[PDB]
Every structure is written in structure tokens, then in C-alpha cells.
Copies of this chain bind each other. A is one copy, B any other.
Amino acid sequence: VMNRLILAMDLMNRDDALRVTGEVREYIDTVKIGYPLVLSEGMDIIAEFRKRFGCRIIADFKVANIPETNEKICRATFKAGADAIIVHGFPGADSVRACLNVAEEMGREVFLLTEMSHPGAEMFIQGAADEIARMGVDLGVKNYVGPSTRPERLSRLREIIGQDSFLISPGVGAQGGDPGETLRFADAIIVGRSIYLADNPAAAAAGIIESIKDL
């Protein structure tokens, strides 16, 4: 990932999403697109971003249904041009395997979400997160998501998945996480509001990158 920085593009308007992404494209070549933008503007937005910006697209679709439904969601998402899809591990191994099978068929990637960054993640997810990570390892998952807001958890996750696995981390900036600290454990950070709600998104991205280079 260019500059170890992934833009979370959660603006809900195509014009604003295209403006901001264009402004920060010199700094960022991977964009995470989720349901706020896709449900507002359509799945065609993924191929539009890929063509216009030449970026990789990670679909943050928190996939979390039964295996048969997960299959259909993954196939629609890869058909739309996404490079990778973020999948919850909490629904269990069969739900994750369904996504892995479609990614294998379509030459794409799954990122396994093992612990979330928000306060409510402490209630149920955190207690299962180590086991979710170990399940990922046993399924052959190579790409993971864990929380910038809890670097001790992010260290434990890294310990389980090993150094070869790729780990990306949201919760930097708005949610309280720090770029440098998070990059002690994660390969890349995800940043949304700190960039896309800034008066100058390019300056916000550049400031983050400057602090990343220093590491």
C-alpha cells in the first residue's frame, strides 16, 4: 500500500467522494469503499474509482451472513471490480470459508476482521478475537484487520497471525488511534474522517504521511 495509508471513503455523495479521492490520490493508491457510498451511489462506483484513480479497492462489506448468502455477496462484489472484501470472523468458519472460496474462484482476496475498533467491541468481539484470528490462520487467511484504538490487542493479533500476514488497521485519527503507534504492528493504516472531513484533505493526508516517513 502506497505510504502504508488506505483512504476510507465514506462520503455518501459521488461528487464529494470523487473530489476528495482525487485530491489525495498522489498519497494513497488503495481506497476502502463501504456501504455508505455503495448504497447511496450504486456498486458501479467501484469500477468508476478503479478506472479514474487506478487504485486498488477494498470493499468494507463486513460480511456476516450464512455461507450461502456470503457466497452471493462476494460474487457480486468481485463482479463489480473490488480487489478485496472485508469479512467478519464472528459468524464462524463456514461463513468465512464461503468467502474464501469465491475469492479463490475469482482471483481476489479476503481480509478477516478479528476485533473492531469501537468501544462496543469490548462486549462480545474482544473475548472471541484471539480465537477468530487463530481460525483465520487455520483457514489459510493471509490478510487481517484489527483495531488502531487498542495497540496491545493489535500486538496480540500480530503475534497470532505472524509476520508474513498482512494487517491493516482502522481507528486512526477520529477514533483516537495514532498512526505511528499503529504501524508498529500493522502494515497499513486506514484513515477516513481525519482526511475526508478536513478543510484540506491533501494536507491532512500529507501530514499523516510525513509522520509515517519519520518511523
Contacts and interface: CB of A to CB of B under 8 A. Distances in A.
B122 A80 contact: no
A93 B65 contact: no
A39 B80 contact: yes
Contacts of A66: 116-118, 175
A10 B80 CA distance: 18
A-B pairs, 6 with minimum CB distance: A92-B120, A36-B72, A92-B123, A94-B120, A66-B118, A39-B76
Interface of A: 10, 12, 34-36, 38-40, 42-43, 60-62, 64-67, 69, 72-73, 76-77, 80, 88-96, 116-125, 128, 131-132, 135, 175
Chain copies in the assembled complex: 2
Contact of A118 (B89, B92, B116, B121): B92
Contacts of A80: 39
A128 B116 CA distance: 16
A54 to B, nearest CB: 23
Contacts of A118: 66-67, 91-92, 94-95
A10 B72 contact: yes
26 contacts: A10-B69, A12-B76, A35-B65, A35-B76, A36-B69, A36-B72, A36-B76, A39-B43, A39-B77, A39-B80, A62-B64, A66-B116, A66-B175, A67-B120, A90-B125, A91-B124, A91-B125, A92-B118, A92-B121, A92-B123, A92-B125, A93-B120, A94-B118, A94-B119, A96-B120, A124-B131
Nearest to A129: B124
Contacts of A36: 69, 72-73, 76
A122 B92 contact: yes
A132 B120 CA distance: 12
Nearest to A91: B120
A90 B135 CA distance: 18
Contacts of A135: 123
Contacts of A60: 65
